[PDB]
Amino acid sequence: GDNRIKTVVILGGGTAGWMTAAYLGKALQNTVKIVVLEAPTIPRIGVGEATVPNLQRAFFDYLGIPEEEWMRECNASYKMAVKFINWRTPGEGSPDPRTLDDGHTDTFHHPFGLLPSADQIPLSHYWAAKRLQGETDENFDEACFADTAIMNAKKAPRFLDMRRATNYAWHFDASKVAAFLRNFAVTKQAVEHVEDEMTEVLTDERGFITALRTKSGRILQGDLFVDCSGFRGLLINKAMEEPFIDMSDHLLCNSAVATAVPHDDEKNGVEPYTSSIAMEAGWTWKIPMLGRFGSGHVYSDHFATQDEATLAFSKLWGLDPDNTEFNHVRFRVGRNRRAWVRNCVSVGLASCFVEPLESSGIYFIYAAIHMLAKHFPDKTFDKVLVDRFNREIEEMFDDTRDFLQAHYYFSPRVDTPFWRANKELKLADSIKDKVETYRAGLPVNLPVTDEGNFEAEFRNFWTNGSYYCIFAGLGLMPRNPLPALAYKPQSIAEAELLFADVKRKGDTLVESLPSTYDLLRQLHG
Amino acid sequence: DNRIKTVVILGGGTAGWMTAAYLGKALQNTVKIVVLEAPTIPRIGVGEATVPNLQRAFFDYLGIPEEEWMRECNASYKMAVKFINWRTPGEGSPDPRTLDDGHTDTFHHPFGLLPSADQIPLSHYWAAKRLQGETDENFDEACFADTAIMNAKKAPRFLDMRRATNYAWHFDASKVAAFLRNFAVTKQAVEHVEDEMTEVLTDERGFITALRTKSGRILQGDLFVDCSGFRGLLINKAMEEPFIDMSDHLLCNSAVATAVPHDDEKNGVEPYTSSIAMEAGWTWKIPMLGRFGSGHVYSDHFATQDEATLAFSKLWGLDPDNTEFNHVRFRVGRNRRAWVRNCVSVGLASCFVEPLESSGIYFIYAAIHMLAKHFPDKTFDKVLVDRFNREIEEMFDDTRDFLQAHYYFSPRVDTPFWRANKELKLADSIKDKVETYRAGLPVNLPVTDEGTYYGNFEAEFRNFWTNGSYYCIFAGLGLMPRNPLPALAYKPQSIAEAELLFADVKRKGDTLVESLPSTYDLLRQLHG
Ligand SMILES: N[C@H](Cc1c[nH]c2ccccc12)C(=O)O
Structure with a gap:
């Protein structure tokens, strides 16, 4: 016979909806009808979104979309790290780094370059030895990654001829990525865009979803439903009654106030990195794009009111707290007990969320979509497929939650x-x-x-290098060097050449690379 | 300077001399290394099998070329473990019985990773076709060109020594030990003391300060490696660390072995290890140039040594009185902790399973590798010790479980x-x-x-036992998925891409089964 899923209905557009639609369009090879139900788009100012480097490999490359093509359509810039400012020093927020007890600047980078090795030991460990033994005054980020010097000079991760210099991720307008992917899904993948509100969720006797009723009275039948409805979880929480597990016992932030800020890219150049600017009741992102930068103060409302937060946020950039346009979000932090229940799969905010401290939102979406395609059911909805999908989402999420908690606790x-x-x-x-x-x-x-x-x-998402970037950056060090290094003089010496190579390539590239600004100007024809 | 200054290794053989040689290179002559070994009573070379990482991870780390060590220990090539009669009842026999469905009762567990189409391994496309009647091919022959190369007994290299396929090694254990002793003493300034141990001297915390020998000489040290075999003279006896018996997971606890002269002219040489099923266990066959090692592994709760020796002798048609047998009674399991205070267990003193998937040398290499990485100073940081212990326990339990799956299914x-x-x-x-x-x-x-x-x-x-190894054993024993991977029902282009991969396996297999020398002819050339 034929027990296959015939129709998939995705509730919600934006990034989660149109990423799911586009990815499943390619994955299911036109054997399945795909519908996106999206309420018409109330326009909000592009507050900016940051990503991790696997986005092009895991997503756009699967879809056959060249990097330059999608960047041109969503005002995208380059990201070589998250730069953490004032995370060690007390007082009011400021774009400018305060000065540490030891006299150094309170800035440290988390770049994506992965560390060379000598004798199967990463350069991280040789740096740590020299620091704990007084043989260097260099920061981990400066010693170990040429990327640090390139970012200090605001240079681009590519040359004008588009040769790669370094590893990098992306800054972009979320709503314009959504728009680009909608158009791709509709015109290239026969996805049906239904512009309407959902009013009823129809369920059979055993609690499976059969269809969504729209305002216009159209009935969208389906065998499998993707909840991309955002924090409300219209299908996974409301209709399906799956409890959300609050994880404010692990992270405290639960609110943000955001906006977009015009920027003189002539004077200042463009920072090829996201900034995490510490504040009294949380932190504030800065996501440079060509012409402006997105920013949002993430805070706990148990430790600041919206007004306190808006004032403090406005003070930071010196904005008029009444006559500038603000978006105010109160978010869920945590994940559903189960991401996928019966014939309902949650993806994006409907599934899980943490604050965007290490740019985990888009990654959560393509990881979940990738795992859905791999665990894609037939109408029997085998419990093992569903359980193994749920296992991958909980391990993915808890891993990143824990990494983020380390940023606060230390x-x-x-x-x-x-x-x-x-x-x-x-x-x-x-x-x-x-x-x-x-x-x-x-x-x-x-x-x-x-x-x-x-x-x-x-x-193995958060590797050795990323733990060092955050631990050492916040000033947490090992008790002692790796004991094996005390027996490996040849290896110490091999590591000295690697540090020299980092210095040389840093200096060579800080001289030969164009500015982020000049690469962006060339890219946006 | 709080460093370890001297390392004393109790016991030679593979565990002792691999530890000595590896630490010799790893510690860059900043540490004195002593091996205390009772002088070597010669024993019949019953043969040992390995995994492919051994040349890269060990001999190449030491700068010993592959051809050099193989020539000194009568080594041959291994492209898999072949399981014979593991599905069909009756007495042991070298020759495969036939299944109810007409297939011969052989399946291979070769090396390499399976290719993928649309991020799905070739295993899964094979399974779809088998469950849907579109193929009568075995998993091993569909998915690995190596299966066809082994069926023809061809070599994993050409005579000019170009690599054709993945492979590991068969060798004489005692000759590899001998080769490494000589290398450690003459090239790495290791001190060989040929004597028995009589005393283990301890401080007030129970840390070892020295070993007394029979001759009365006192070997001082800061770190002791117990390579003493099943007796665990340091880890179990002196340190009193309990051994966790795991006969509630595997039943075999005995072996009777020997070496068998072989007409390599008539039969050629099999470039694989055979696991020949028997009534009370199984029997290895490890081909080398001129002979093959064999041993019947059995449970003594289900057969006596006589029963086992007779059944083993019957298999090859050996004279059960006038052939030389080695009788081993082994412990199966691992210490509660591999490393206690300044005592590190390696080899049989640490842990054992039957050599059903050639895990002996690998267990030694992994422990040695992890010792060098976790190498302490005199403060013996408990986190270093704990993380070493965690790696050895997870390594062992993983392989114990994999092995149990062979019997349970x-x-x-x-x-x-x-x-x-x-x-x-x-x-x-x-x-x-x-x-x-x-x-x-x-x-x-x-x-x-x-x-x-x-x-x-x-x-x-x-990722030691990958998807491919689970398919080799599950599908080989006849455990199949309930249904194909549902995703495949939506991916006709991916099905088709997989059909090209099956075609590539067929072509490579056929091209190489024609162009390669026999294992025999490569061995003849190697041991010139
Ligand atoms: N890590 C695996 C181990 C392996 C694969 N096939 C066999 C056959 C017999 C013994 C071990 C293994 C590898 O070496 O590829």
């Missing part, structure tokens, strides 16, 4: 009740174990690759 | 041995993987190419 700051309450939170066992490992001088989640394949990154 | 129920296998519990870890397989999903999908996998030990160690 901040030295104690000046406001927010920063103090961070130290009151329990750490998940998983991240206590990794702290203990790091503190003994051992690597955490050693990377295995030279490519810098989505599947390799998904199983 | 054998369809055989004809003897009380095969029946008792099905009375044992499966560990959770392996139940979960069976359930995943049975829904058509991959188990332990490889995440790197072959270059990375066999080039960086850390990539192999985190």
Whole structure:
């Protein structure tokens, strides 16, 4: 016979909806009808969104969409790191770094370049040895990644002839990526765009969804439903009654106030990185694009009111707190008990969320979509397929939640009740174990690759290098060097050449590369 | 200077001399290394099998070329373990019985990673075709050109030594030990003390300060490696670390072995290890130039040594009185902790399973590799020790589980041995993987190419038994998924892309089965 899914209905557009539609369009090879039900788009100012480097490999390449093509259509810029500003020093927010007890600037980078090795030990470990033994005054980021010097000079990750210099991710307008993908899905993949509100969810006797009724009275029948409805979870939470697990016992931020800020890219150039600017009750992103930069103060409302937060946010950029356009979001932090129940699959905010401290939102969507295609059911909805999908989403999420918690728990700051309450939170066992490992001088989640394949990154997402960037950046160091280094003088010496190579290539590239500004100007024909 | 200054290794053989040689290179002559070994009573070379990383991870680390060590220990090539009669009842025989469905009862467990189409391994396209009647081909022959190369007994290299395929090694264990002793003493300033141990001297915390020899000499050290074999003279006896018996997971606990002269002119040489099923266990065959090692592994709760020796002798038609037999009674399991205080267990002193999937040398290499990475100073940081212990326990339990799957999913129920296998519990870890397989999903999908996998030990160690190895054993024993992977029902272009991969396997197999020398002719050239 034929027990296959025939129709898929996706509730909600935006990134989650149109990413799911486009990806399933390619994955299911036109054997399945795909419908997107999206309420017509109330226009909101492009507050900017940041990504991680596998986005082109895991998503746009699967779809056959060249990098330059999609960037041109959504005002995209380059990202070589997240730069953390004032995460160690007390007081009011400021774009400018305060000065540490030891005299150095309170800035550290989390770049995506992965670290070379000598004698199967990463350069991280040789740096740590020299720092703990007084043989260097260099920061981890400066010693270990040429990317740090390239970002300090605001240079581009590519040459004008488009040769790659370094690894990088992307800044873009979310609503314009959604628009680009809608058009691609509708014109290239026979996806049906239904512009209407949902009013009823029709369910059979055993609790499966049979169809969505729209305002216009159209009945969208389907065998499988993707909830991309955002925080409301119109299908997964409301209709299906799957509980959401709040994880404010792990992260405190639960609110943001955002906007977009015109920018003199002639004077200042463009920063090829996202900035995480510390504040009293949370932090503030800055996502440079050609002509402006998106920003949003992420805060806990148990430690600041919306007005306190809006004032503090406005003060930061020196904006008129009444006559500038603000978007105010109150978000869920956590995940559904189960991402997929019966014939309902949650993707995006409907599934899970953390604050965008390490740009995890788009990644969560393409990872979930990738796992849906791999676990794609027939009408029997085998419980093992569903359970293994749910297992992958919970491990993906908890991994990134824990990484983020490490950013708060190991901040030295104690000046406001927010920063103090961070130290009151329990750490998940998983991240206590990794702290203990790091503190003994051992690597955490050693990377295995030279490519810098989505599947390799998904199983080991936050590698040794990323733990060092955050731990060492916040001032947490191992108790001692890796003991094996005391027996390996030849390896120490081999590592000295690697540090020299980082210095040389940093200097060579800081001279030969165009500015982010000049590459963007060339790109946006 | 709080560093370890001296390392004392109790015991030689493979575990002792591999540890000595590896630490010699790893510690860059900043540390004194002593091997205390009782002088060597010669024993029959019953043969040992290995995995492919051994040349890259060990001999190449030491700068020893492949041809050099193979020539010194009568080594041959290995492209798989071949399982014979694991599905059909009756007495042991070298020759495969026939299944109810007409297939011969042989299946291969070769090396390499399976190619993919649309991020789905070739295993899954094969399974679809088999469950849907579109193929009568075995998993092994559809999915690995190596199966055809092994069927013709051809070599994994051409005579000019171009690589054709993946492979590992058969060798004489005692000759590899001898080769490495000589290398460690003459090239790495290791001190060989030929004496028995009489005393283990300890401080107030129970840390070892020195070993007394029979001659009365006192070997001081800061770190002790127990390579003493099953007796665990340091880890179990002196340190009193309990051994966890795991006969509630595997039943075999005995072996009777020997070496068998072989007409390599008539029969050629098999470039693989054979696992020949018997009534109370199984029998290895490890071909080398001129002879083959063999040993019947058995449970003594289901056969006596006589029963086992007779049955083993019957198999090859050996004279059960006038052939030389080695009789081993082994412990199966691992220490509660591999490393206690300043005592590190390696080899049989740490852990054992029967050599059903050639895990002996690998267990040694992995422990040695992890010792160098976790190498302490005199403060013996408990986190270094704990992380070492965690790696060895997970390594062992993973392979114990994989091995149990060989017995639990054998369809055989004809003897009380095969029946008792099905009375044992499966560990959770392996139940979960069976359930995943049975829904058509991959188990332990490889995440790197072959270059990375066999080039960086850390990539192999985190993914040792891949999707391919689960299919080789499950499908080989006749456990199949309930249904194909549902995603495949929506992916006709991907089905078609997989058909080209099957065609590529056929072409490579046929091209190479014609152009390659016999294992015999490559061995003849190698041992010139
Ligand atoms: N890591 C795997 C182990 C392996 C694969 N096939 C066999 C056959 C016999 C023993 C071990 C293995 C590899 O080497 O590819």
